[PDB]
Amino acid sequence: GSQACAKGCELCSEVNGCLKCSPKLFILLERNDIRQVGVCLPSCPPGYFDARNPDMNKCIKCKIEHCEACFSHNFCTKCKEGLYLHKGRCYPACPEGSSAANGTMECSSP
Amino acid sequence: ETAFVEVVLFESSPSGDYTTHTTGLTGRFSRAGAMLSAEGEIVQMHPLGLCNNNDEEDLYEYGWVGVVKLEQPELDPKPCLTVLGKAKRAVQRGATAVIFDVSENPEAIDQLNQGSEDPLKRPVVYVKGADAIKLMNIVNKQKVARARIQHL
């Protein structure tokens, strides 16, 4: 730990990595081994989404499976081709209950 | 209220036997949690790592030992959670124990030991000085480590 912090990082730690990013940038928590370190990014990597906060910009891991872009960690906005989107989640087949079926791609009725 | 912390590094041989290497360091049990023994896989948590929505970042197998290096209070003017809040969150997320590094934030000790509420069912331990530096050195260098918290 012989050098200053990272490019877009204004508050740094040896252990914790980056603590605070430049206002435009996003902080992302990277788990490498035991360590969890802050890292400053211009954009969120795939798997993560753009959690737009008034206090800190975060890249948050999406937890929904077969999802390419999610509104939150458990709600999904768009599902990978060619899966159907029921209540925030992705399915290879519309769940049991009513269903879209063109119905362009989102499962309604309930 | 002394807590003995053993950090265990382990390696597997082809045969199937485990070789271990252990180092000791000391801390104190805090009133935030029970004064019980605990053992578990070490997981370092970033300050922001126990915050809202980030919590559900990843899932760990139940029974991990959270390790948190606290920053100087000016570097964290807007904490998402109190230290107690962080401990509680960690335990809710399957921590068998929580260890705080309070060298840069000694004041946190007072926040841990002086709480109006029910102490957690799991141990909350803090470390400082050479012990904290030792623990952090292990955390930084090693890929995997098991922690054993002993006494009282």
Numbering used by the authors:
A (entry chain E): 36 to 145
B (entry chain A): 57 to 208
Sentences from the paper on this structure:
The ZNRF3-RSPO1 complex reveals an extensive interface, burying ~1,200 Å2, between the two molecules. Apart from some side-chain rearrangements, no major conformational change is observed in ZNRF3 upon binding to RSPO1. The dimeric arrangement observed in the structure of ZNRF3 is conserved in the crystal structure of ZNRF3-RSPO1; the two ZNRF3-RSPO1 dimers contact each other sideways through H-bond interactions made by the β1-β2 flaps of ZNRF3. In two copies of RSPO1 (denoted chains F and H) the Fu2 domains are less well packed and display higher B-factors than the other copies (chains E and G); these two sets differ by ~20° in Fu1-Fu2 domain orientations. Gln71 and Gly73 residues are located on the ZNRF3-RSPO1 interface and the Anonychia-related mutations, Q71R and G73R, would affect binding to ZNRF3 due to steric clashes and electrostatic repulsion. The structures of ZNRF3-RSPO1 and LGR5-RSPO1-RNF43 show that binding of ZNRF3 or RNF43 would disrupt the 2:2 LGR5-RSPO1 complex.
Zinc RING finger 3 (ZNRF3) and its homolog RING finger 43 (RNF43) are trans-membrane E3 ubiquitin ligases that negatively regulate Wnt signaling. ZNRF3 and RNF43 contain an extracellular N-terminal protease-associated (PA) domain, a single pass trans-membrane helix and an intracellular C-terminal RING domain with E3 ligase activity. Interaction of ZNRF3 or RNF43 with complexes of frizzled receptors (FZD) and low-density lipoprotein receptor-related protein (LRP) 5/6 leads to Frizzled ubiquitination and endocytosis of the heterodimeric receptors, thereby reducing the capacity of Wnt-driven signal transduction. RNF43 and its homolog ZNRF3 have been identified as E3 ligases that ubiquitinate Frizzled receptors for degradation, whereas RSPO1 captures ZNRF3 for removal from membrane, thereby increasing Frizzled expression on the cell surface.
